[PDB]
């Protein structure tokens, strides 16, 4: 009537929490947000949510002046997306061995680590989590 | 005004011939745009080498500053443009010039571990 | 209490399960998981294991040729189950410099390498990307 | 001892699901953190979500710290470190520089940049614990 059986497509109220060990042989699907701006300076972040990780990918191209250690004002992260700490984002310019990153705070507007620019094409594929708290400065 | 635009973006994007008739036209040399970096600052750090040569010969300004105090010689410090870096020196780059964390071209030099161009720098 | 799941004991659920509320794994939770490890070109390796939609990835090896700027690592190309929609980019370091690369796994699963050209070194990095 | 549709309970045994699940509110694995000074002045913040580890490179290089050199102020403790080897990539403030942290199973963390003496390292990201 209302328990969960071994069989049949079935919705489960309740805070269930299991004590042993869990096996998903088909998907597993939780909620997702995506989202995707111009952060500045031609930077492009494309990101997306699941729980409390955020996938992100940096695109687009260097196609106005961005100084040295600078914020990126024409597009903020919205909200939800943004960590309780500020997590780096490594990434790297196409075509020679230069590296960069760019810190994603709780406000939303990233700031760029990499010196001072005005060309190129950065990238850069990975995570960063909404709430791991950093711990002590 | 929309020269000095033109200017900022042929220089850096390396419109060699752009550059060459927009200053023909009446682009000022030493525009800037809104952090402070000029068509030289552009070209050099961009490692667009005939246009700098031709902004110095229309009388670039080689030690021209942005917002942070960076010169061009900064610039291709940074990237570790060796060639660009000695026409700076020829037209009396100031190889002292200190940005706003007091860092030179050199400090630059030893930050980046280039060797190459601490060799040239430390020479002069 | 044939087909009743208890809150003891091992047992088998099939059907969809749509838990509306909160649900905590206290022990491990276990996701379909395949590995695969190759010569991408030019010596260099990668290492990825998938569990669920994400490919774990570790950069090895040692360069050991030409590989010029830009251009696509034609060794072996990585399966087409570990291949992503779209284009990621797999940031890396070289050993005792300061110098950073990035290899590009597209769909074709054909990486491509995004330094300069470059004839040796020791190429690293551990990353996630996803698979969606 | 009844898996009800509703309610809060806690289910003990080991469940496989063969078919599809959703999970609509949020799926809480196991967490646990740990911080701490590498040495050099680098700092490393750990949070072990699962069988994935979350990093975060922070601190500021206070000392010499030599190309190859073993951190020997602080070594990972054994609960967060990896089957293998684990590269991971950083970067300094203010340039194009990059370095690594290589994380092995012994926790005893070793640093792949040149020697360095100055500079603020920092990067975000993810190794696996297997």
């Known amino acids: ?20 060990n869990v096996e998903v042989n088909g998907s ?6 995506s989202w995707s701006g111009e952060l500045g300076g031609g930077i492009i972040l494309s990101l997306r949510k699941k729980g409390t990780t955020v ?4 695109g687009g191209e260097i196609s106005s002046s961005i100084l040295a250690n600078s914020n990126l004002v024409n597009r903020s ?41 005005s060309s190129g094409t950065p990238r850069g594929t990975g995570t960063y989590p909404i709430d791991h708290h950093h711990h002590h400065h | 005004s929309d020269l000095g635009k033109k200017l900022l973006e042929a ?16 682009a000022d040399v030493n525009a800037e745009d809104k952090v402070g970096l000029t068509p030289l600052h552009l070209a050099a750090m961009n490692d667009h080498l005939e246009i700098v040569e031709v902004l110095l010969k229309n009388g ?12 061009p010689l900064h610039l291709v410090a940074m990237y570790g443009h060796l060639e660009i870096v ?24 030893i930050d980046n571990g280039n060797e190459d161009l601490a060799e040239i720098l430390q020479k002069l």
Request: net charge negative.
């Open chain 1, 77 to 117: 992260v919205p909200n939800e997306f943004c960590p309780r700490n500020r997590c780096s984002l490594v990434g790297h310019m196409v075509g020679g061995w230069n590296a960069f990153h760019i810190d994603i705070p709780s406000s939303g507007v990233c700031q760029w680590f990499g010196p001072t620019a």
């Open chain 1, 55 to 58: 996938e992100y990918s940096i």
């Open chain 1, 1 to 20: 009537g209302n328990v969960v059986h071994k069989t049949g497509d079935e919705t489960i109220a309740g805070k269930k929490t299991f004590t042993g």
């Open chain 2, 60 to 71: 670039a300004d080689v030690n021209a500053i942005d917002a942070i105090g960076e010169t």
């Open chain 1, 28 to 33: 597993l699907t939780l909620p997702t947000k």
């Open chain 2, 11 to 26: 220089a850096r994007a390396g419109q060699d011939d752009e550059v060459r008739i927009l200053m023909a036209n009446g």
């Open chain 2, 86 to 109: 000695e026409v700076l020196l020829k037209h009396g780059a100031d190889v002292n010039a200190q940005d706003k964390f007091g860092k030179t071209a050199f400090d630059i030099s």
